[PDB]
Amino acid sequence: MREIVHIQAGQCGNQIGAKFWEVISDEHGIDPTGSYHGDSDLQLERINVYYNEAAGNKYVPRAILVDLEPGTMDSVRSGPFGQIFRPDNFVFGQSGAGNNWAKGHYTEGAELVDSVLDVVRKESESCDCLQGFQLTHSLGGGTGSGMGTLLISKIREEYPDRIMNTFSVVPSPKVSDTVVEPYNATLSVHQLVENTDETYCIDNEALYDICFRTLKLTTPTYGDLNHLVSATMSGVTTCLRFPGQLNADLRKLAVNMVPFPRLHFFMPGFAPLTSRGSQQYRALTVPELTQQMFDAKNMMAACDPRHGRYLTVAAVFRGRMSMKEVDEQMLNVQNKNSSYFVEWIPNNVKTAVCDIPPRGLKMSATFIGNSTAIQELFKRISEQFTAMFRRKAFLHWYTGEGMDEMEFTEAESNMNDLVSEYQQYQDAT
Amino acid sequence: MREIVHIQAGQCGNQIGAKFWEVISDEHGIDPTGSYHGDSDLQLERINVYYNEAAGNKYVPRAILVDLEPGTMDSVRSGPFGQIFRPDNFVFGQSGAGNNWAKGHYTEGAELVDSVLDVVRKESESCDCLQGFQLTHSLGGGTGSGMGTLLISKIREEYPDRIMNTFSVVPSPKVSDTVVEPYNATLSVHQLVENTDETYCIDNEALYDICFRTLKLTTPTYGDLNHLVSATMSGVTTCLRFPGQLNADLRKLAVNMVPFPRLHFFMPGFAPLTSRGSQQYRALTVPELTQQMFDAKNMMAACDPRHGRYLTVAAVFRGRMSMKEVDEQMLNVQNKNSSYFVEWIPNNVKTAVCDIPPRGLKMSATFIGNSTAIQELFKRISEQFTAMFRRKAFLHWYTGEGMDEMEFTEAESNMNDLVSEYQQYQDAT
Amino acid sequence: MRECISIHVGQAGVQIGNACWELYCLEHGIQPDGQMPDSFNTFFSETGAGKHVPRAVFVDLEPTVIDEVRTGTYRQLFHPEQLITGKEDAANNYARGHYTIGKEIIDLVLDRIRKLADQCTGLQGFLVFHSFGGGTGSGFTSLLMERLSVDYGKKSKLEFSIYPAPQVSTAVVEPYNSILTTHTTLEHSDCAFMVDNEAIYDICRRNLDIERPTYTNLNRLISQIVSSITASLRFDGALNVDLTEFQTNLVPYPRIHFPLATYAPVISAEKAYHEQLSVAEITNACFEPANQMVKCDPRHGKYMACCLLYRGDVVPKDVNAAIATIKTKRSIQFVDWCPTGFKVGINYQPPTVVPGGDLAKVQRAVCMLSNTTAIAEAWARLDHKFDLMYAKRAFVHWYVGEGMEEGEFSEAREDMAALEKDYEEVGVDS
Amino acid sequence: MRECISIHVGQAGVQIGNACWELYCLEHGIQPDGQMPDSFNTFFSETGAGKHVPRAVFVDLEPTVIDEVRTGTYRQLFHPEQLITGKEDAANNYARGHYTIGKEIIDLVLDRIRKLADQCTGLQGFLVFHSFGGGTGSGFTSLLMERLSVDYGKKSKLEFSIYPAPQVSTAVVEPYNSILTTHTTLEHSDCAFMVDNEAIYDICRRNLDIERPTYTNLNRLISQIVSSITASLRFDGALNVDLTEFQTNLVPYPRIHFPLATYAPVISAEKAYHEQLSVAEITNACFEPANQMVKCDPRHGKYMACCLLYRGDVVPKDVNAAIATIKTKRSIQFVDWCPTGFKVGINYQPPTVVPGGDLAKVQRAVCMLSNTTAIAEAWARLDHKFDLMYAKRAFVHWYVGEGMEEGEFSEAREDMAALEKDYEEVGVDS
Numbered sequence A, B: 001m002r003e004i005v006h007i008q009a010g011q012c013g014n015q016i017g018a019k020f021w022e023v024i025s026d027e028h029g030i031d032p033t034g035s036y037h038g039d040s041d042l043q044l045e046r047i048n049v050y051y052n053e054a055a056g057n058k059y060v061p062r063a064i065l066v067d068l069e070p071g072t073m074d075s076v077r078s079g080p081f082g083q084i085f086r087p088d089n090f091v092f093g094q095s096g097a098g099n100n101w102a103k104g105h106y107t108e109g110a111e112l113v114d115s116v117l118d119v120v121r122k123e124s125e126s127c128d129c130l131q132g133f134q135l136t137h138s139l140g141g142g143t144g145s146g147m148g149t150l151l152i153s154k155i156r157e158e159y160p161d162r163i164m165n166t167f168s169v170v171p172s173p174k175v176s177d178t179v180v181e182p183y184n185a186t187l188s189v190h191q192l193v194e195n196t197d198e199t200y201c202i203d204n205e206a207l208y209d210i211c212f213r214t215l216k217l218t219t220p221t222y223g224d225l226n227h228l229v230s231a232t233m234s235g236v237t238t239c240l241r242f243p244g245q246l247n248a249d250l251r252k253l254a255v256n257m258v259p260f261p262r263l264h265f266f267m268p269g270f271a272p273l274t275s276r277g278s279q280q281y282r283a284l285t286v287p288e289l290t291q292q293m294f295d296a297k298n299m300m301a302a303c304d305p306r307h308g309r310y311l312t313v314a315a316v317f318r319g320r321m322s323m324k325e326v327d328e329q330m331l332n333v334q335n336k337n338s339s340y341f342v343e344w345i346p347n348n349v350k351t352a353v354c355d356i357p358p359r360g361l362k363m364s365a366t367f368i369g370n371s372t373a374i375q376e377l378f379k380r381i382s383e384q385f386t387a388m389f390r391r392k393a394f395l396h397w398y399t400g401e402g403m404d405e406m407e408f409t410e411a412e413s414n415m416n417d418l419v420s421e422y423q424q425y426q427d428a429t
Numbered sequence C, D: 001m002r003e004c005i006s007i008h009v010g011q012a013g014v015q016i017g018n019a020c021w022e023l024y025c026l027e028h029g030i031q032p033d034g035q036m037p038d039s040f041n042t043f044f045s046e047t048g049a050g051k052h053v054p055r056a057v058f059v060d061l062e063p064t065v066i067d068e069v070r071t072g073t074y075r076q077l078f079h080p081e082q083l084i085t086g087k088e089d090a091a092n093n094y095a096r097g098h099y100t101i102g103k104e105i106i107d108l109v110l111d112r113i114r115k116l117a118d119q120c121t122g123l124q125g126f127l128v129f130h131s132f133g134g135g136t137g138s139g140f141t142s143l144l145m146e147r148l149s150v151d152y153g154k155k156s157k158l159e160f161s162i163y164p165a166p167q168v169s170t171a172v173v174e175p176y177n178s179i180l181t182t183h184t185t186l187e188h189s190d191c192a193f194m195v196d197n198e199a200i201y202d203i204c205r206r207n208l209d210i211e212r213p214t215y216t217n218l219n220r221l222i223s224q225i226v227s228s229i230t231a232s233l234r235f236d237g238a239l240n241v242d243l244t245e246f247q248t249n250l251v252p253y254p255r256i257h258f259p260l261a262t263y264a265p266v267i268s269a270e271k272a273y274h275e276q277l278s279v280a281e282i283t284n285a286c287f288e289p290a291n292q293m294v295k296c297d298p299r300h301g302k303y304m305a306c307c308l309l310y311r312g313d314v315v316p317k318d319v320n321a322a323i324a325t326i327k328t329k330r331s332i333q334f335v336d337w338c339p340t341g342f343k344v345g346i347n348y349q350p351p352t353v354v355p356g357g358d359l360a361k362v363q364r365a366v367c368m369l370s371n372t373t374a375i376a377e378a379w380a381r382l383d384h385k386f387d388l389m390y391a392k393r394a395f396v397h398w399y400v401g402e403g404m405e406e407g408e409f410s411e412a413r414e415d416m417a418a419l420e421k422d423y424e425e426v427g428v429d430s
């Protein structure tokens, strides 16, 4: 009953993915071997959403791990929880893509993709009623971006009526992690606009800010960053996996959040978030949570929601709390912050409530904002793309792999059109 | 009640045969001396199918071991279980055939054949109700191929109303094990088409692939390969030897699988097959087994079933399982893979179920596919034959033994006709 | 799995190789006899029981330098067939290296490479160590590269090069050798890492307080840089960079494939105790011109790509912060066609220190590979040097005597002129 | 049961025999006195109580070489009647070997063979060791073969031959001897394994690091090859090959019965420690022209049959893999009439090593028997040599003086011309 298929591409994709898996196992009372050692029957009731049941009271993630290089895979295998994964679900190459989108999409990735697809199909067939697919990856590299997009394209072709959702780690504004990342992002976005139903935009710049400023982590590590992402991810599917009072799911959320097909790029957020010492000096009531959710400093995308308008916002609450209170809070935010919400979508806040809170907390919240401010990010990428492409810088690395200028051009154009569309709705009255 | 007579020819034939015997003894609770040390009365009920009862609570294989060279025989005798065999049932020459079909069929083999035949007749007379004969051998050498075919011919002449089944190890496509193997195979096939009722095609290339890819055996040995073959073999007779819910036998299987007399060349398969570590991470339910059975990577013949169509498929299941489930699975495979099944044989899947599973497993499956793709194999052999015969290469080795070109020619022609026939049914609507 | 084949050509290449393989052994816990009481495997193949052999070829046209290896401490480390020697050297003559002497052993060298490559399951590529100035380093290397390009195709090839100094030469004919080998190798090399002996000496004197640094010291320093480049492949890291990634991220146009290496921190133990070496601090050190290993001025050029490879106790956020501040800095200008100029690698393993070495043990290190229009200056200098001698046909008769044609000189020179113009064109803003 | 009779003719044949029987004894644990403190039995008959005697005949027309055997370490190993000597040698004259001197002992030799054969229950055939160049190796051997063909018929006969080198001769009349004996033996031999002293010396120098290899070394090497050929008969194996199988699988036409032997690995202990010797690795070694034991170029010819005999720690799948990759390789081309070119044997017993030998102890070995159109070159050379001397009738008077007729020379030459044409015809594609 509503199986989700999990797919992980590249170093980023696999590191976030592992963390996510760790989070989920703890929640469902699963140990590093796949055995259930939980307390309550509710933990196992909907375990089939993420786990296949193997022989001898074991549970195995419906997870496929993909990379053109093996090192990351090896690391995962050696990690805590590495042994829970199905050995045949690790699909790795030997070559790599050399941070090149073309290599991931057309060359090395192409050589590996069929093997992935075979596994994927099998996984799909395992499931009684497949909800769809969640892909974790970056847009800035070669495998996650080129191979990942290719995978998406094929999956969509095979299963056009299932939901495709992505958790994409997007390039940062202040500093680039690679030189060609604008190319890789731009190309990837071209595919994503046509082939995903919803995309959570996650940015490391925002994450670091959150960790340093809000969590009071002097020197945050990538693991810590991943943890936040995992928390968000778990939050989005919580209403599918546990009983609630007003239950959401992936389809419903998409319907509420996506008024036009191309505008499916969300700014995710998570609340609460406190230091170790600071948590004793405040109570986690619903209004506090709401307040934490609605501000720029708590968004995991490097763009200010106050630079645009919210088209829609979905809030997913976990824990025992009063529905009336929640509703009041939702009303209040709309009323007081009227200028940040588009006027032609009345009651543009959607609420879901799941009775099971995450571990360690009595209540939590997950925020999904569809804000016209995300256009800024796209614009930056377009600018950076242009600056390089106009001088044909690095182009021979991509053309050498069989790619043509036309493809680049079209991709750019598509991106530009999306930006224009975003602008149009931002400005509409 | 339904005695089977077992015959082994040449090195291959004897190595596979020994393994088979070992498998069978374990199943029926027989130790290396011929004494029953099993637990249940069901193990002895139908022991007469493969064993003669000797004096003093001993059981002896109804097995005849034949070779033109003695070394293999000696090895067998010295092996674990070597002492279980009747000493008078080892019939060996001193000369060999020098990898020459002619020597096996007309010369050295001819000198030895009468001695074999005498034993065979005696064995037949021992039995209350002889089902027929199973021959294990290769087609690529001289003894298994030439002598074996000769033996078959004589046996058929003597006992035309009994079933003749063969487990033939066929030449590989990528690499040849001998230079003249196309000649030896082609000649052998000429005999097999006219004189066997059913032939299981087993190919070492496929076997290695299975062992390396599926079983995760880094460096498989011939013993391991033989084990797989033995498992298949035991599977085909399981319903004759143990009580079941829907019982098959050799005759029934032949009837179901052979719609036209010449088309009796099967691609055998066995399921399940897993690594040592990987078995804990999956349950052996019937659908899983079915899935394992129906794919190209699990076939023991080096040809892709997706390159042709299935005329018929027989599936034999062992263990306690639900008949309904089995039926559903059978239906499902037919429905979803419609294009790989000939349209003019409705319900072309035959099912048998035996309640006794093999040792170590709770359930297993054996697959017998009659696929038009096997024509590829024959075509390859024909091509290779032609390439050599057109230049009369190596021909003096065969003509020197009294053979004429006409015989070769006729053999070639027969092979070609078979291929044509296969093609015709593949293409028919 | 991800094997790397190292080729050491001529005296420079061999001696540097000595330092590199010494370091690798210490890093992986391999003894000088090949024994150890899984990461090693990209650099060492494994044989029988308790022995590990470098994935390397050492080649020189004379026996003397390699004979030291054969008779030395690491005699048991290498298999005899991977230590290749001729009888007579190339005598600082590219012609002898490329043609007369080199054509006698090229087949042999390549045969051994083929044998090495046959035992690789996931060959990443080749690391070639040599100099621009020697007859072997120039002529043989060019020959070798040509053959490799033919027989292996698009497999990644990387060069570490002892580029000639502005005012510190050994040979008189260095400019000729440099020019010809650059010309001949250009279309066959994917990325070449220049390093200059003068600069390293300065570093040794200024930063390490060494009155009289020896070639050994320089070699040791080089070994560190090489280790940083390959540590991402030999060890587990937070954020990883492989040999294929450099050429994508550091080479914007095919001909402009000369990034420069800078390593930090280079300090003595006595000086290390009074300093806390943060990521920001070492990055700043790197991005200051005095710590560069080529005697050139980036303040007078523009950056086209910077790749920063951090190792040890390093935290991604910190690196980001460090880079951000360097971005602001006046002395760092980037070309106008490149808004994203940084590629960043972070590896968990701290730099290993060779017993009896000149460097102190640090918690963090960083190796920058940067590509700068300032390199044009060096090329201009070299061209000028060539021009002065060639105008008089000084030494030319030697080259012709070894089978080179005079027209090829002019050809080399014009190609280099073109290269110089290419840099200039790249320099200007859109 | 499956007995094999060995015949050693002339100095070469006898000396090689010494090396072979020494090896066999070590392999079966037979002491030099015939004692041991069941596999032996194909090569050794057994007498009374605690003594084993070689199924062998050693023949030479002079006493000196066999006298060494009689007085030497293995004096007690052989029965006196199996060591046969005349008084005067054939003096590098085929005529003396075949007629004048040979006709005096041929009856004796054959009588002893008959006695040997009478104690065989399952005679597989004969292994004949000799040279092409000597008067005994050429003339006597031809005589012997003729008689054997008559008295034993279709029993398999195999030859191991010291084929003359291209530029390393002992005698001047070698070409004459070679040509005549090839002519006379052709229709009587089923398969003959050529081996060349020059090639073996090269192998010894290059692969074993021996400055000055002796005939002893060559003999030892040969003994290995022979052991590989017969190990499938002397030991238990996974997949087996017998003496009758070779001629079926290696001889495509009656006259084209000259396959060549290649053995791998041939290494010293010092060199063996830095190498892991896989099936793929040794197969590749074999299939490279420098390790061949005839000085000829397969790259310039085509393969008609390859038979690969593996021994020791060898796994069938691995062998298959190895062969598959070699099939792809550009340097291996097969004739168009032969899509299946490989016969493969695999035996469990590792190669045994002679105490004080030049070869290191290995877990695996392989012996390839391959038949190549490249052998035509050798024949052409030999014919040319014959022509040069015969045009002047140089040395001819000797042969005529010993009862040969001049017409027989021309006959031999024309037959060889025909042979050469046959190879050529075979060469071309359909």
Ligand SMILES: Nc1nc2c(ncn2[C@@H]2O[C@H](COP(=O)(O)OP(=O)(O)OP(=O)(O)O)[C@@H](O)[C@H]2O)c(=O)[nH]1
Pocket (backbone or CB within 6 Å): C009, C010, C011, C012, C013, C015, C016, C060, C061, C089, C090, C091, C092, C093, C131, C133, C134, C135, C136, C137, C138, C162, C164, C170, C197, C215, C216, C218, C219
């Ligand atoms: N860094 C460093 N540079 C070296 C070393 N040895 C030589 N060089 C430099 O290399 C150049 C001389 O080249 P060599 O490698 O000795 O010459 P070669 O390659 O053997 O060429 P020929 O002897 O001419 O055949 C000069 O610029 C030297 O300063 C060394 O150990 N370390």
Ligand SMILES: Nc1nc2c(ncn2[C@@H]2O[C@H](COP(=O)(O)OP(=O)(O)OP(=O)(O)O)[C@@H](O)[C@H]2O)c(=O)[nH]1
Pocket (backbone or CB within 6 Å): D009, D010, D011, D012, D013, D015, D016, D061, D089, D090, D091, D092, D093, D131, D133, D134, D135, D136, D137, D138, D162, D164, D170, D197, D215, D216, D218, D219
């Ligand atoms: N490999 C090898 N070749 C040998 C050996 N002894 C001699 N030869 C070669 O055999 C040829 C000479 O023939 P021999 O066998 O000495 O002569 P022969 O057969 O005794 O004939 P005559 O003395 O003429 O009666 C030359 O090509 C030698 O190089 C040996 O021990 N090993």
Ligand SMILES: Nc1nc2c(ncn2[C@@H]2O[C@H](COP(=O)(O)OP(=O)(O)OP(O)(O)=S)[C@@H](O)[C@H]2O)c(=O)[nH]1
Pocket (backbone or CB within 6 Å): A009, A010, A011, A012, A013, A015, A016, A068, A069, A096, A097, A098, A099, A100, A138, A140, A141, A142, A143, A144, A145, A169, A170, A171, A177, A178, A204, A222, A225, A226, C238, C239, C240, C245
């Ligand atoms: N949040 C988070 N971001 C990461 C992680 N690893 C990498 N990134 C970010 O992702 C981008 C590069 O991701 P990476 O994993 O190298 O992609 P890749 O496609 O696997 O790289 P490649 O195989 O083409 S070379 C960089 O912007 C980096 O900052 C991680 O573990 N967590």
Ligand SMILES: Nc1nc2c(ncn2[C@@H]2O[C@H](COP(=O)(O)OP(=O)(O)OP(O)(O)=S)[C@@H](O)[C@H]2O)c(=O)[nH]1
Pocket (backbone or CB within 6 Å): B009, B010, B011, B012, B013, B015, B016, B068, B069, B096, B097, B098, B099, B100, B138, B140, B141, B142, B143, B144, B145, B169, B170, B171, B177, B178, B204, B222, B225, B226, D238, D239, D240, D245
């Ligand atoms: N699966 C399997 N295949 C084998 C075995 N032994 C041989 N073969 C295969 O059989 C073929 C040759 O079989 P072999 O046993 O030599 O036939 P033979 O007739 O006895 O050979 P001969 O006496 O004429 S020389 C080869 O293709 C080889 O790969 C075995 O034990 N198991």
Ligand SMILES: [Mg+2]
Pocket (backbone or CB within 6 Å): C010, C011, C062, C089, C090, C134, C136
């Ligand atoms: Mg030098």
Ligand SMILES: [Mg+2]
Pocket (backbone or CB within 6 Å): D010, D011, D062, D089, D090, D134, D136
């Ligand atoms: Mg002599």
